[PDB]
Amino acid sequence: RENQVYSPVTGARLVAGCICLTPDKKQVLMITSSAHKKRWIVPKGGVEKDEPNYETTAQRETWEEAGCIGKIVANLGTVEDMRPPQFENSRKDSEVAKHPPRTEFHFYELEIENLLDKFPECHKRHRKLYSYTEAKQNLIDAKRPELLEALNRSAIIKD
Ligand SMILES: O=P(O)(O)O[C@H]1[C@H](OP(=O)(O)O)[C@@H](OP(=O)(O)O)[C@H](OP(=O)(O)O)[C@@H](OP(=O)(O)O)[C@H]1OP(=O)(O)O
């Protein structure tokens, strides 16, 4: 639908999600991408026109995509999907040609309180806890460095 919300400045799609950590902070909850079933990402989704804040979207998507309930304990701020829709060298560095972001992500750290077996997307995805090291590799394999930046801002133990 066109319940979707876009940055009035950049036209980027506004998305909220959760870095869901175990109480002991050693593991993060990851879900499989719907499109590519072997990519592990974190729960996230489009803000809808009715939603009063990013926390509402984040907790709605964490339940819908991962069957996860918990408490928001930190605002992890924003990251951008800077994937292009070719290059510009500058003497001692190279860059992709200027473009607006595809997506602006608002991420929150959640402490997991419960995982349920039945949730709206429970037949369309897997959901599993990973150590920092495994999660980092997962998000590089998924080609989602912005999701890794959000994970790095979380209190997850990096030992
Ligand atoms: O609503 P759409 O425009 O189709 O957005 C999709 C959708 O993102 P949302 O969950 O934010 O709606 C996919 O996510 P899921 O199907 O996994 O829930 C996501 O795929 P990822 O799983 O890899 O995030 C994909 O992004 P991609 O470009 O990687 O296909 C992204 O499309 P956009 O490129 O338009 O954001």
Author numbering: 20 to 104, 113 to 186
Provide text from the study:
ScDDP1, like its human orthologs, adopts the canonical Nudix fold showing two β sheets flanked by helices. The active site lies in the crevice situated between both β sheets. The longest helix (α-1) contains the Nudix box (GX5EX7REUXEEXGU), which displays a β-loop-helix-loop structure that binds the Mg2+ ions involved in diphosphate moiety orientation and catalysis.
In this binding mode, the unique axial phosphate at the 2– position is directed toward the active site. All phosphates participate in one to four interactions with protein residues; thus, P1 makes two (Arg32), P2 makes three (Arg32 bidentate and Gly65 main chain), P3 makes four (Arg152 bidentate and Ser53 side and main chain), P4 makes three (Ser52, Lys63, Arg171), P5 makes three (Arg102 bidentate and Arg129), and P6 makes one (Arg129). Several water-mediated interactions stabilize the inositide. The mentioned residues are involved in the binding of all inositides studied in this work. Focusing on inositide binding, we found seven positions for phosphate recognition: Six positions are defined by the InsP6 complex plus a seventh defined by the “Pβ-to-be-cleaved” position in the PCP-InsP7 complex.
